[PDB]
Amino acid sequence: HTINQTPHSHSISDPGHAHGVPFGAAVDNGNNAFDTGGSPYNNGIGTTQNQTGI
C-alpha cells in the first residue's frame, strides 16, 4: 500500500527556568563583580539574548 503522510509537529511544554548570577562583590575595588545593596527594585536591567542549545 501507498502511505499518504503529511509532516507533523509537536508542542513543547516549556516550564520557566531561572539562571543565577554569583558575581556579588565584597570589596568595592576593581571591576570583577557587582557591589551589593539593601532594598531591591526593578531598575530595568535584563540579561542578553542567546539561543539555548537543545
Next chain:
Amino acid sequence: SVNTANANLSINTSSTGISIQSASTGLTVTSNAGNGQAFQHDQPYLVFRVFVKV
C-alpha cells in the same frame, strides 16, 4: 518537555493482485432419460376366414 503528538498519515488505496485460474465443474454424465416400454405395431393387413377341407 515535548508533548505527545500524532503523525498525520493515511493509507492510499490499492487494488489487490488476485486472479482465478481454471476449474472443471466435475460432472461427466447426465441423468438417464428413457424407459423401455412395449410399443404396439401392426403392418397393413386384410382379414379373411380360413376353412380346412374335412
